[PDB]
A paper describes a structure:
[name] (HA) is an IVA surface protein that allows the virus to attach to host cell receptors and enter the cell. HA is a homotrimeric glycoprotein, with each monomer composed of two regions: (1) the head, comprising the receptor binding domain (RBD) which is crucial in viral attachment, and (2) the stalk, that is responsible for viral and cell membrane fusion in the endosome. Mammalian IVA infection is initiated through HAs binding to α2,6 sialic acid-linkage galactose receptors on the host cell surface, before entering the cell via endocytosis. Following endocytosis, HAs undergo conformational rearrangements due to the low pH of the endosome, leading to membrane fusion.
The full length mature HA1/HA2 trimer crystal structures are as follows: (1) A/Fort Monmouth/1/1947 solved at 2.95 Å resolution, (2) A/Jiangsu/ALS1/2011 solved at 2.35 Å resolution, (3) A/Almaty/32/1998 solved at 2.05 Å resolution, (4) A/Hickox/JY2/1940 solved at 1.95 Å resolution, (5) A/Netherlands/002P1/1951 solved at 2.5 Å resolution, and (6) A/Melbourne/1/1946 solved at 2.55 Å resolution. The antibody [name] Fab failed to bind many of our other IVA HAs, as examined by analytical size exclusion chromatography. Failure to bind correlated with an insertion in HA between 146R-G147 of the epitope, whereas sequences without an insertion bound the antibody. Our other IVA HA structures all contain an insertion near the [name] Fab CDR3 binding site that appears to prevent antibody binding, via either insertion of an Asn which becomes glycosylated to physically block [name] binding, or insertion of an Arg, Lys, or Ile into the [name] binding pocket. Although the insertion of either a glycosylated residue observed in the electron density of our structures (A/Netherlands/002P1/1951 and A/Fort Monmouth/1/1947) or of a bulky side chain which partially changes the loop conformation (A/Jiangsu/ALSI/2011, A/Almaty/32/1998, A/Hickox/JY2/1940, and A/Melbourne/1/1946) appears consistent with the loss of [name] antibody Fab binding by analytical SEC, rigorous mutational analysis and quantitative binding experiments would be required to prove these are evasion mechanisms. Interestingly, these insertions do not affect the identity or the positioning of the sialic acid binding residues, allowing these strains to bind the cell surface receptors while eliminating nearby potential antibody recognition sites.
Residue numbers in the entry:
A (entry chain A): 4 to 324, 330 to 359, 363 to 492
B (entry chain C): 4 to 324, 330 to 359, 363 to 466, 469 to 482, 486 to 492
C (entry chain B): 2 to 324, 330 to 359, 363 to 486
The structure:
């Protein structure tokens, strides 16, 4: 008596299918990465720039609270934290701030340099009194490290004129401010001239600022305001500053080097000496799976983020220790006793064997099925959040509509692919067992009684020799009938 | 003679499959909601705010045509109509109007309050002559209810300085205007001083305005212009207004409560005393279907909008009153006489029965298949159109490219899924019938003749026919 | 020794497709879904030629930059072509305010009429109209200027308050351009416009802007320390625009009455114009295809297949070519019959004296015809989709626009490549099914009268001639 049957094991792997959920299967692959090291890591060997208690504004202006960032020159990405609260210390408006954050997100390294050396650039103006209790440091009134708040020298503020020629071979980021006093008494005290102007021109930047005197609510005990400005000076170009008051002059500028794959993320994780190909605000990922459910914000080469809790793909068959009627059908159960293949035979004679041809073709096909569908899935490169000022609610909502829309498409695509192809993987195995069985019934013909549960009760007695004949596809029906 | 066959009924339900269109099937479910009550309803018990003939500007400024909106304090969504034509009655520019619309789209309730009480805040200026024929009410010249057009008092306009401290614990929306007269005679008549300014400053707002005198084409017979401005004053912050002319001063402001799920829609439907979980400009939807084709604009929890006319999913089989060769194959037709199941047996002996095991496993799987794909579809929360001014065409087109891209993908996903899985569901039934038949062929073996159309050498009564549903040797 | 056999088609095809279980599967018949061929040329759309800006860009064309004189008599087009040499824009340095928006507005203009809105010869009697030239806009070795603007200057040391209005009686929206000049010095301001403090005012019923010229020492661009800010507005039909100035006005000279169409746009291409008509135009060349997908270029004009990032989308229709789930094809029926030319599934007889089965074969064609059609319909054609432009303070919006384009393209490429992978398996299964059903159809007829070898052949236990073979194939046995 020869029987035909399929594999069973001690596996608890569950997948879901179109017709049935919580289907226990013999073998499966996880497609969804849910593990991370909970740390900030280097990316391709380059550590990120950690702004800590500072935000982008405080770093680029040189807020005294951020002095430890002053020597930073190259990074792989930028990390803000939940306590990145130090930006502008003196009240005002940072014009096109979010655009500057976008500019700095593709900066891989920069050279901070003294664009107008303090001790020699301003002989006719005071360079020593531009400090405020709003930018305190070490118990004293102080000021930004990258700006120089010029004031009158000996009751005079002559027309100032200073130029810089960009000989760096790179774009130079130039920052300045215009100070808006709270009274004309303050205007006279700081700059002498009551009717001031500031002009900033380059070959592609051209703005004139007229300071406004006004009574304002005090912010950090300050009724004045500084508006902060920035521009990118192209290589070879000149930028010209002219003023008779109220100029918060550039002191340090940045020659920028552009790179690929950087971005600004907000994380509470701590920096460790790890190296990763993929970084999230939650931690680093080490995986080749096509999907992750850890965070939508990613730095590097990452799996696509999806809103799923499980994405298990069946590769083996139903674990029983059907569209084609064999598995869980007329062959009621599986054989844990057969460990060496997915499909096989069981011989019971006087004197368990798995079929290698059918099992190796199934193994080949399922491997191509897993590989071919993961291939259609593409690596997620750097994708981060974006910031918008309080008059850009429509754009902010448009950006959120775009990100949520794609995330819903990819989550639907992923969950539905697995659900529908899991059911086709079980039908594939059921088909393989039904084809192996029928190939044995066309080989024995009249020489055996079909019991109907995958077994052929032999009428004659042939020992092991002809039993391998049945399996090998070399069984001689005439000799025994 | 015992036969194996499948169910048929008087159903005309049609589906489309990958290999054949217009396939009549025994049972199906519609996945596409196309019905609505044609009314505006409450959402979670809260009525919408109906602006009627007014648009957002006329309402929030207090255009005299909108007096009936003045007491409105809480709403679930905002309805403009095709006749929402009353906005600014005196001509000019409403600066960052579309942004204000976006801001108000997330307001669930507000408190309208007098930020500068008219009779006590302006002792040195006139509060009684700032009316215009462009904002007529009751046959007389009038003005906005939330603005106060100050003018000179006794031939002088002293420098004015007024401040408001937000003690409301909420953002306060403050609106004001700057008037730009058409001539210097008009400037002197209204404000005396020829060179005027308006300054409005807070802790995070800081703007100064110089009125501009120019000859302009008349709009509503007005050659002057008013620029309307707004800002959100944070809790605890102070806003200071300073001017020596041309100030349309704030009179009423709004303490705002933010909420989730609101929006502004344009509808011609009328309000009724219904409550709904889902509202569109055409009418409210009461459905659990994953899709609708009624409107892309939705308020609440709604089915996903798709551009399809039909999304019917086959649950039963082909209606005959195959991949596996049985249904519409060697079993050429179905049995209307069998009413109690999808697959069953028919006996003709000397002395119709549905199989419960095979039919209930088909029902269990088909139920899971419909439920499993409807879960993959997630409810649509509030999604409404947006507005852009005439220098934001690129942004407007980008918004339209985004909205169109998503709808083309979803319409494709839904239409293709139903098309492919319909063929797949009918194959499932063909497999169940071919598996039912083969289970019988191996039980009867040589004791019966297989006619080959799904259909006894001995004479076997009713008792033994249920045996199969069979001790072959015992009754051989 | 009389045998009917059941088989399937074979031919000499090298057509190859990919399947979810196997790659490089050679099939008998397949259809390409992916247009990769174009003519390499720019062509008319609906018989209307594009506007080739050539060495000029939108700014230089619309202002009338003298390098662009040859575009002046162009009145209608089907789309606008910039080239990689489209570098002539503003010739006098300055800022073209809201330029990208203006490009976006012209993308929808099908034709326009250029006309003297303020005729030079008669609109400015109290001002000079002949001295507003510069070496920055050189023409023919001489100082010249934009063809559509007029640089008004002082007349005999008098530049009086100027005021001119235009009432749009054209029935279409009118595009009006002007400039405001910002001189380098206080002397330049007096030398050109006399009055020290000047202003420009431009008001319509929906437009109200004022300009105050700013004098500042500036780096020279094209030998000019001054700057001009260029401006534009659309005057609605019946609306009136009014210019008032006391200097610094670069006045509108020619304006444009626009006709809006559908489906135009601006593309960058380096292909040459050729005398051809096309429903579909891309920067690389024109497409003539009914296929649903193309991989030529994402920019298109007209009605085009949808762009995907794919190198091959071939969809099997015929059979596995051998000269499955169901066990017949490449199963117990091991190989195919090149000798059965007129059908997908048929019979072979060995009598004493190949045949296609019409019924099962013509049903499989109808099914396969319907599958490929049903899939092509779900795909919709690409209407005009073009790139957008953004100035240097719109980097976030530029990226957001790219995240959108990149997002959709990835999704449609995934959709097309997964649809063909998965449905190619289903089609091969379908063919293994049709063969098996036919082979079991024959088996149930013969029952006891024939021995089943198991390779699709039935050796009939009686004698069976050409008449009895037709019985088996006809089903009349
Ligand atoms: C748009 O279409 C035109 C049409 O052909 C196309 O033109 C090509 O331009 C390139 C570059 O401008 C040409 O290139 C050269 O070929 C000559 C021989 O004719 C060489 O001598 C040149 O070499 C010199 O210069 C280099 C730069 O310094 C040096 O590195 C080099 O050692 C040489 O000194 C140069 O290779 C080319 O001839 C034409 N034509 C063709 C058919 O290529 C243009 O490129 C297209 N534009 C775009 C943006 O695609
Ligand atoms: C489960 O199977 C693995 C591999 O056969 C074996 O190493 C392990 O001991 C088994 N455990 C149990 C509890 O059966
Ligand atoms: C799923 O099946 C497992 C067997 O692997 C069982 O232990 C578990 O309770 C089941 N859970 C559900 C939710 O069906
Ligand atoms: C971030 O980590 C620090 C370290 O303990 C802790 O003070 C803070 O609560 C954390 N914040 C969040 C949001 O996890
Ligand atoms: C990532 O995981 C693999 C899994 O075996 C491991 O071999 C490899 O060392 C891991 N990489 C890092 C950087 O830890
Ligand atoms: C069709 O059959 C259903 C069975 O539920 C019955 O209710 C209905 O009345 C029938 N149609 C007609 C026209 O009688
Ligand atoms: C669908 O079939 C019915 C009858 O089978 C027919 O009356 C109807 O016209 C068909 N539908 C279409 C759109 O042709
Ligand atoms: C709404 O639908 C529910 C079921 O979801 C139904 O019970 C109820 O009658 C319907 N009511 C209205 C007003 O449509
Ligand atoms: C197959 O034979 C036909 C018959 O002439 C021929 O036209 C065709 O080119 C051949 N196949 C290939 C790939 O050339
Ligand atoms: C694919 O199969 C063809 C036969 O049709 C063969 O010539 C070729 O080398 C194979 N491999 C490819 C195309 O990479
Ligand atoms: C497009 O291709 C068809 C197919 O040969 C051809 O007949 C037609 O002339 C072509 N049309 C153009 C405009 O090239
Ligand atoms: K800002
Ligand atoms: Na506006």
């Amino acid at each position: 008596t020869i029987c035909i049957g399929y594999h069973a094991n001690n596996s608890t792997d569950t997948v879901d299918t179109v017709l049935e959920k919580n289907v226990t299967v013999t073998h499966s692959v996880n497609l969804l990465e849910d593990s991370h090291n909970g740390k900030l890591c280097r990316l391709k060997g380059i550590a990120p720039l950690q702004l800590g208690k500072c935000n982008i504004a405080g770093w680029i202006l040189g807020n005294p609270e951020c002095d430890s960032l002053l020597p930073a020159s190259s990074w792989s990405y930028i990390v803000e934290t939940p306590n990145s609260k130090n930006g502008i210390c003196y009240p005002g408006d940072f014009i096109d701030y979010e655009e500057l954050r976008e500019q700095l997100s593709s900066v891989s390294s920069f050279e901070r340099f003294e664009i107008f050396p303090k001790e020699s650039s301003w002989p006719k103006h005071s360079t020593t009194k531009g400090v405020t209790a709003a930018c305190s440091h070490a118990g004293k009134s102080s000021f930004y490290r990258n700006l120089l708040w010029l004031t009158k020298k000996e009751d005079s503020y002559p027309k100032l004129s200073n130029s810089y020629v960009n000989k760096k071979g790179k774009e130079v980021l130039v920052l300045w401010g215009v100070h808006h006093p709270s009274s004309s008494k303050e205007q006279q005290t700081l700059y002498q001239n009551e009717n001031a102007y500031v002009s900033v021109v380059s070959s592609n930047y051209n703005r004139r600022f007229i300071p406004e005197i006004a009574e304002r609510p005090e912010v950090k005990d300050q009724a004045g305001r500084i508006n902060y400005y920035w521009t990118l000076l192209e290589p070879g170009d000149t930028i010209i500053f002219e003023a008779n008051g109220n100029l918060v002059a550039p002191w340090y500028a940045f020659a920028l080097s552009r790179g690929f794959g950087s971005g600004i993320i907000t994380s509470n994780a701590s920096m460790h000496e790890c190296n990763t190909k993929c970084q999230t605000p939650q931690g680093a990922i080490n995986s080749s799976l096509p999907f992750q459910n850890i965070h939508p914000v990613t730095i590097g080469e990452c799996p696509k983020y999806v809103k799923s809790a499980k994405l298990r793909m069946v590769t083996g068959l139903r674990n029983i220790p059907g569209l084609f009627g064999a598995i869980a059908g007329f062959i009621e159960g599986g054989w844990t006793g057969m460990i060496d293949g997915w499909y096989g035979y069981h011989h019971q004679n006087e004197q368990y064997a798995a079929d290698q041809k059918s099992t190796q073709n199934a193994i080949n096909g399922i491997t191509n099925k897993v590989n071919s569908v993961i291939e259609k899935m593409n690596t997620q490169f750097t994708a981060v959040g974006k910031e918008f000022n309080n008059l850009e609610k429509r754009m902010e909502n448009l950006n959120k509509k775009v990100d949520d829309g794609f995330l819903d498409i990819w989550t639907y695509n992923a969950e539905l692919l697995v659900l529908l192809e899991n059911e086709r993987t079980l039908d594939f195995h059921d088909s393989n067992v039904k084809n192996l069985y029928e190939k044995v019934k066309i080989q024995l013909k009249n020489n055996a009684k079909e019991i109907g549960n995958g077994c052929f009760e032999f009428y004659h007695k042939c020992d092991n020799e002809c039993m391998e004949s049945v399996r090998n596809g070399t069984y001689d029906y005439p000799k025994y009938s």
